[PDB]
Structure 1
Amino acid sequence: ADKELKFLVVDDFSTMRRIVRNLLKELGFNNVEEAEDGVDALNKLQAGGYGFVISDWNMPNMDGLELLKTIRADGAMSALPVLMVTAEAKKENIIAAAQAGASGYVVKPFTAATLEEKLNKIFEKLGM
């Protein structure tokens, strides 16, 4: 993985988006854009050029699972890595996300080390 990989951080809370953006910055990942819900995110991904998506599970209008299913069904982006963020792990949620294509899942709040760990595990699983 290239430090210039372009990330899309999706959440309806601007403070959480700021947190994620700062943790990526601490790891050396500075090309970050933000979206406020699943629909806003698709508007942006359509622009093209993204390399990785971090999305919260709970968002209005289009939630995390709906955004992920849409990305996996799209011919041009079907392989984009998606890391799902959630406030609480639930077995069913983890299986539904995995079966729909999620590259990994992380429970918030998390630290830079934990994010780094998640990113490395995905990079390794995907051969990046």
Structure 2
Amino acid sequence: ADKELKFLVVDDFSTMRRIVRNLLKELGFNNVEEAEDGVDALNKLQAGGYGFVISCWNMPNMDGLELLKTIRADGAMSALPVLMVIAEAKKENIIAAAQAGASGYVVKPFTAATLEEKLNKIFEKLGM
């Protein structure tokens, strides 16, 4: 897909956001913004222009699942791709995320090759 796509990386840990931003940079995606929680992310998404969201599951104020459910219920961004990042492979959370419309999930820490593969399969399914 277009490497110009604007990404939003959501996580309450700045170091984790830097890691994901670096992995996107390795893959050639330079247009990235950050958010510390689900509410902050929704506020940036309203600004428009985003094409992809990578979000942490566990965050204060509004967690990853609630952010995902809010994006999917929004008329202007209902199909916005959302990749969930989880700390452990808890089946209940993977299924909850899938049922809520996650585009995919990755267990951190993840490699650039894993990110690339997830991005490719996701854009592929969307015809982008």
| Aligned counterparts of 1:52 and 1:125: Cα–Cα separation in 2 | 14
Instruction: Compute the displacement of 1:2 (Å).
Output: 0.4
The DSSP-based 3-state class of the residue aligned with 2:20 is helix
Q: Deviations over 1:10-58 (max 9, x none)?
A: 0000000000000000000000000000000001000000000000000
CA distance in 2, matches of 1:89, 1:121: 20
Structure 1, unmatched stretches of 5+, are none
1:69-115 deviation digits (Å, cap 9, x = unpaired)? 00000100001000000010111111110110100000000111111
**Whole-Å Cα distance in 2 between the matches of residues 3 and 114 of structure 1?**
17
Runs of 4+ aligned residues of structure 1 deviating over 3 Å after TM superposition are none
2:7 alignment partner in structure 1: 7
Cα-Cα RMSD: 0.6
> May I ask how many residue pairs the two structures share in their alignment?
128
| TM-score, reference length from structure 2 | 0.98
Secondary structure of 1:65's counterpart equals helix
Q: Distance in 2 between matches of 1:125 and 1:14?
A: 31
Measure how far apart 1:125 and its partner are.
1.7
Q: Post-superposition shift, 1:127?
A: 1.7
**Counterpart in the other structure of 2:115:** 115
TM superposition score normalised by structure 1: 0.98
Aligned equivalents of 1:111, 1:91: Cα separation in 2:
21
State the match for 1:103 in structure 2: 103
Distance (whole Å) between structure 2 residues aligned to residue 125 and residue 102 of structure 1: 13
Q: How does 1:1-128 map to 2 (within 5 A)?
A: 1-128=1-128
Q: Identity of aligned pairs, percent?
A: 98
